[PDB]
Design an enzyme around this catalytic site. Sequence first.
Site, PDB file in Angstrom:
ATOM      1  N   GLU A  69       0.810  -1.193   0.000  1.00 28.38           N
ATOM      2  CA  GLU A  69       0.000   0.000   0.000  1.00 28.38           C
ATOM      3  C   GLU A  69       0.865   1.274   0.000  1.00 28.38           C
ATOM      4  O   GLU A  69       0.505   2.235   0.604  1.00 28.38           O
ATOM      5  CB  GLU A  69      -1.135  -0.013   1.093  1.00 28.38           C
ATOM      6  CG  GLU A  69      -2.417  -0.816   0.790  1.00 28.38           C
ATOM      7  CD  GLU A  69      -3.720  -0.593   1.664  1.00 28.38           C
ATOM      8  OE1 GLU A  69      -4.209  -1.695   1.784  1.00 28.38           O
ATOM      9  OE2 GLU A  69      -4.098   0.477   1.940  1.00 28.38           O
ATOM     10  N   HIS A 178       1.122  -8.228  -2.898  1.00 35.66           N
ATOM     11  CA  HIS A 178      -0.147  -7.824  -2.292  1.00 35.66           C
ATOM     12  C   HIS A 178      -1.259  -8.408  -3.161  1.00 35.66           C
ATOM     13  O   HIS A 178      -1.508  -7.909  -4.255  1.00 35.66           O
ATOM     14  CB  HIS A 178      -0.246  -6.288  -2.200  1.00 35.66           C
ATOM     15  CG  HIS A 178      -1.445  -5.801  -1.436  1.00 35.66           C
ATOM     16  ND1 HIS A 178      -1.765  -4.458  -1.295  1.00 35.66           N
ATOM     17  CD2 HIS A 178      -2.404  -6.489  -0.776  1.00 35.66           C
ATOM     18  CE1 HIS A 178      -2.885  -4.343  -0.579  1.00 35.66           C
ATOM     19  NE2 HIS A 178      -3.289  -5.556  -0.249  1.00 35.66           N
ATOM     20  N   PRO A 183     -13.206 -11.527  -0.311  1.00 32.14           N
ATOM     21  CA  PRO A 183     -13.374 -12.868   0.263  1.00 32.14           C
ATOM     22  C   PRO A 183     -14.020 -13.845  -0.677  1.00 32.14           C
ATOM     23  O   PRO A 183     -13.864 -15.057  -0.476  1.00 32.14           O
ATOM     24  CB  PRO A 183     -14.295 -12.651   1.488  1.00 32.14           C
ATOM     25  CG  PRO A 183     -14.213 -11.208   1.780  1.00 32.14           C
ATOM     26  CD  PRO A 183     -13.800 -10.476   0.543  1.00 32.14           C
ATOM     27  N   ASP A 221       0.966  -9.413   1.827  1.00 31.23           N
ATOM     28  CA  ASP A 221      -0.411  -9.325   2.301  1.00 31.23           C
ATOM     29  C   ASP A 221      -1.175 -10.231   1.353  1.00 31.23           C
ATOM     30  O   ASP A 221      -1.392  -9.874   0.205  1.00 31.23           O
ATOM     31  CB  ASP A 221      -0.963  -7.900   2.269  1.00 31.23           C
ATOM     32  CG  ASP A 221      -2.408  -7.811   2.701  1.00 31.23           C
ATOM     33  OD1 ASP A 221      -3.087  -8.852   2.849  1.00 31.23           O
ATOM     34  OD2 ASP A 221      -2.874  -6.637   2.912  1.00 31.23           O
ATOM     35  N   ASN A 283      -4.409  -8.048  10.459  1.00 34.98           N
ATOM     36  CA  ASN A 283      -5.343  -7.002  10.063  1.00 34.98           C
ATOM     37  C   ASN A 283      -6.360  -6.892  11.192  1.00 34.98           C
ATOM     38  O   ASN A 283      -6.899  -7.908  11.609  1.00 34.98           O
ATOM     39  CB  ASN A 283      -5.991  -7.418   8.740  1.00 34.98           C
ATOM     40  CG  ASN A 283      -6.910  -6.357   8.084  1.00 34.98           C
ATOM     41  OD1 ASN A 283      -7.790  -6.708   7.355  1.00 34.98           O
ATOM     42  ND2 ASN A 283      -6.627  -5.047   8.320  1.00 34.98           N
ATOM     43  N   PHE A 288     -13.399  -7.063  10.703  1.00 32.27           N
ATOM     44  CA  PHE A 288     -12.557  -8.210  10.385  1.00 32.27           C
ATOM     45  C   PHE A 288     -11.246  -8.139  11.165  1.00 32.27           C
ATOM     46  O   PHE A 288     -10.544  -7.128  11.086  1.00 32.27           O
ATOM     47  CB  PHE A 288     -12.208  -8.251   8.875  1.00 32.27           C
ATOM     48  CG  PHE A 288     -11.254  -9.348   8.535  1.00 32.27           C
ATOM     49  CD1 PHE A 288     -11.721 -10.624   8.294  1.00 32.27           C
ATOM     50  CD2 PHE A 288      -9.891  -9.114   8.501  1.00 32.27           C
ATOM     51  CE1 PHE A 288     -10.825 -11.678   8.023  1.00 32.27           C
ATOM     52  CE2 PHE A 288      -9.012 -10.127   8.246  1.00 32.27           C
ATOM     53  CZ  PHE A 288      -9.471 -11.414   8.018  1.00 32.27           C
TER      54      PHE A 288
END
Length: 344
Positions: A69, A178, A183, A221, A283, A288
């Site tokens: 990011e 990344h 989901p 990630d 995270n 979440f």
Amino acid sequence: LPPRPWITLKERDQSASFTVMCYNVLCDKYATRQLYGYCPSWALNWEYRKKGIMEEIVNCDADIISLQEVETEQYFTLFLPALKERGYDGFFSPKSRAKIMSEQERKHVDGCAIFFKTEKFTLVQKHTVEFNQVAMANSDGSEAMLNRVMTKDNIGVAVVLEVHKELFKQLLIVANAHMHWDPEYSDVKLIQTMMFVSEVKNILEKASSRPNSIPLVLCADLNSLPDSGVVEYLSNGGVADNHKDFKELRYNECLMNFSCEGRITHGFQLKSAYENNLMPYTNYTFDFKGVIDYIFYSKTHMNVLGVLGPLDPQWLVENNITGCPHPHIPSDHFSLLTQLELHP
Ligand SMILES: NC[C@@H]1O[C@H](O[C@H]2[C@@H](O)[C@H](O[C@@H]3[C@@H](O)[C@H](N)C[C@H](N)[C@@H]3O[C@@H]3O[C@H](CN)[C@@H](O)[C@H](O)[C@H]3N)O[C@@H]2CO)[C@H](N)[C@@H](O)[C@@H]1O
């Protein structure tokens, strides 16, 4: 905000030791009141958060840093200049190079960066892996490859580094990716992971033939929990081509393009530095909380000496912190930090 602890997992022998950070800093573009409404605007603001982000990176003082990011303009005006002063060089690629957009939008595209301390490592090669191009090139015979995988422009980066003999030509590949987030797209996340590992192996073959043997540290990630096909594929050297996460087409022959029956394999023998849930999450948001960031390493080349444990959970309880970021925590991801021991 109390400093984070350190878990010792194995003593130093008595031959090279170094540290690796993995950290998704949460880019400004995604730090919205819609997603992080529990964080006041002034603590979401980039001019505020970037200070905490840089403090976290400086405090961890890692020999190798993998960030996700990272917005393009921020790599060049914030992360690289500041880390140059701490003795690092860096490699950065944004997503979406091939996409047409304005000058201003281009500054705000995010991507992946790897930094390394130049007193300890020298850059030999650098590489960007475009998952959408690799998917397109391997899509013959699969509408799903074209429709679902090619249309996501996630990337990874990798560097081949020389490990300076003083720390003991020894090479090391550091890779940083990344993956797509949704989901409902476990298949994309799994295929993106196989494409990345497959392309890293191709990189490694061409690092050796220049007058299997080269250790890998893979930061990412992955947007995948530890029970996912992604993590099973990374941890067990392969995955069945009918794994549930492939969401049909499972048994597509196109998966074997990344695949070195019924098993797509790789030979990297990877292990996660934090395995056995040493952090309960990476995270941490209201909606979440879970482990979706990882540092994987070649277990036949490297030992894990220790990791940076989680922020004290009683501190989060006493302060009623149910999600991040927060005035005192500048990203919705916690950083990962491990000390590895490389044996040539
Ligand atoms: N419950 C299903 C789970 O979702 C998790 O991820 C969560 C989160 O990462 C992701 O979404 C997060 C949430 O802020 C919210 N849904 C906005 C936005 N999409 C953000 O995704 C963001 O964009 C990047 C795009 N590349 C992601 O890779 C990166 O992790 C994140 N900063 O989707 C989940 C919602 O929280 C994991 N993927 C995995 O545990 C499993 O899929």
